Design a protein around this ligand. Structure first.
Ligand SMILES: O=C(O)c1ccccn1
Ligand SMILES: O=C(O)c1ccccn1
Ligand SMILES: [Ca+2]
Ligand SMILES: [Ca+2]
Lengths: 344, 343
């Protein structure tokens, strides 16, 4: 019989986010079901076992067996981690999971993570994020200069090029900073989570889109010795649960975000698109950053050329069919809705 | 406990995308149970004709299948909510509806009538529009067309004078070669190239509006399901949930190279005219009204499903589609600029 195994999972999230934290809980729950309770993983909210800033190191050290994180919180350690979470203007969620599981990505990331005593698993995605919450209007790239912005992931490094001062403030600590004015702006994820955390109460302007990542993919880093110690059925249980949550976390966001955005607008949130001039500047800054990271970090250089070719192939294909139909359907659905609303 | 199941799929083994996903599913269930829960997948037609795969599960001939549920619209057209409606939800939205929008529970009530416990276990995304001998310049070119097409889109196209046939995948090419059909859609570049349609039809149209996404189902005999211990049920559910991501991830990875190969070999890739798109969209909407009036099981699901699509499309237009449209265009522009070509 397979042994009884007890793990701790240190997440980076508050329990109140029944989207991203809820998915960590589901993951743990499913592993229990699969192993008849013998493989017991207990999830902990951000900051409870260690500060979320320490969640990668805590796994590498064996302090906890695994975590549930945004890997590019740890770009200070290695910027190549951005291939795991997502690059600015990068792959969308579909394309990212394609790259990871059938495009050779997982193997390249496993090699990277091995250096830090980690076996990595993709275990979620939150899709395209919003552009965040701003106290003052963003009219041009000039408005970014000197901006104190809470932002997670590689997009902070991009925005730095345009004068933004970024901070990866943990989610539960964003609101007081925004309320006090020690930051001017904050992005987190999207309508459902953002409404829960309360940012609309203290910033009137909500921009789109969150170009910061093509999709923000979520990772469970596992300690290599903890992983190797598992029997094959338990390794499979963890893999399968992660694969399943790679669909379910985003399914929950997709299900919950629309009503949340409706509520936000009804409550007074002013929602609009970033100006084209801003989009073009942050796109240009992104591309410059990849050149710089390739030249500075051999681990980034090793992955980028193949990743870029994969994005070129994926974007080209999605323009042919996937996005051709979605563009048509979304517009037709909107027209039909407008027609019904105006039928009186 | 050693449990041995047969899974009757609808697909040729050569499709290492959709059939390979069925194999992966079975393989994962084995891993999760240390070999104890053994499911063996069989290609289309091997145990029963794929046209019989739903009935073979209902009457317990096999424990489960791996199918396009709208192959069986002749039995109940409300099955289209499982697979997908024409101009329906995209894959993400469909999985959202199923798992967090109440879709799965509504489908379970429908399927119980047929002694089935259903699980979503894959998706092939937005399909291509198919293979044609003659250009499609207007809806007039659809009138009288003999077309191989799977799923509810065949019913939509019937309204424009198409005669649809749900010919099994391994039998499409000979019909197209011989000329007993004028046109055929299957799925997309990787599978279509594998099956060989480009050898006998010059025109490849886009997009396959037939489903917003073609979702794949494993129908499980309800007595076979009920007998399983909880860990084995969880193994099957998790394997299905994982393949709901992995099958489409494999198609996404493979399709771009296959399309390049197809074009390099002479396939002419074209978009349906706006006039055709508008016509099939209109016919789709007319069909849902008719199916709602004729089939109480369809009427029961449609209003809530429609509201869910409205909510989803409204939200995706704000951020998801805004960034995808910007990025896909930027990637193309950068490609052109690298070759000193105009974009
Ligand atoms: O820290 C962030 O900004 C973050 C975390 C998880 C998902 C998306 N974004
Ligand atoms: O029969 C079909 O046309 C079919 C089957 C599976 C997936 C997509 N399409
Ligand atoms: Ca974020
Ligand atoms: Ca099809």
């Amino acid at each position: 019989a397979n042994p009884t195994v007890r793990w701790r999972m240190s997440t980076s999230w508050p329990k109140s986010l029944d989207t991203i934290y809820g998915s960590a809980d589901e993951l743990c729950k499913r592993v229990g079901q699969l192993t008849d309770g013998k493989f017991e993983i207990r999830a902990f909210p951000g900051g409870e076992l260690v500060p979320s800033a320490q969640n990668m190191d805590a796994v590498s050290n064996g302090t906890v067996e695994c975590n549930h994180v945004l890997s590019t919180m740890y770009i200070g350690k290695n910027t190549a981690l951005t291939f795991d979470t997502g690059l600015s203007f990068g792959l969308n969620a579909r394309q990212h999971n394609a790259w990871i599981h059938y495009g050779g990505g997982l193997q390249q990331l496993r090699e990277l993570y091995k250096k830090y005593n980690i076996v990595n698993h993709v275990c979620g995605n939150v899709g395209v994020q919003m552009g965040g919450w701003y106290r003052k209007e963003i009219k041009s790239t000039a408005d970014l200069n000197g901006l104190n912005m809470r932002i997670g992931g590689i997009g902070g490094m991009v925005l730095s090029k345009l004068g933004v001062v970024p901070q990866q403030i943990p989610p539960g600590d964003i609101y007081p900073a925004l309320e006090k004015g020690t930051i001017d702006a904050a992005e987190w994820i999207g309508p459902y989570d953002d409404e829960k955390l309360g940012f609309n109460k203290v910033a009137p302007y909500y921009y789109s889109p969150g170009w910061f990542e093509g999709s923000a993919s979520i990772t469970s880093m596992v300690n290599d010795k903890a992983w190797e110690a598992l029997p094959p059925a338990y390794q499979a249980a963890f893999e399968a649960a992660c694969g399943e949550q790679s669909m379910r976390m985003l399914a929950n966001y997709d299900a919950r975000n629309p009503l949340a955005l409706r509520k936000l607008i009804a409550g007074g949130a002013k929602v609009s698109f970033f100006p084209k001039e801003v989009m073009d500047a942050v796109y240009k800054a992104s591309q410059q950053l990849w050149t710089e990271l390739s030249e500075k970090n051999p681990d980034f250089k090793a992955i980028y050329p193949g990743w870029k070719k994969f994005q070129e192939d994926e974007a080209g294909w999605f323009r042919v069919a996937e996005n051709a139909l979605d563009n048509y359907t979304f517009a037709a659905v909107a027209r039909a809705q407008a027609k019904a609303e105006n039928l009186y």
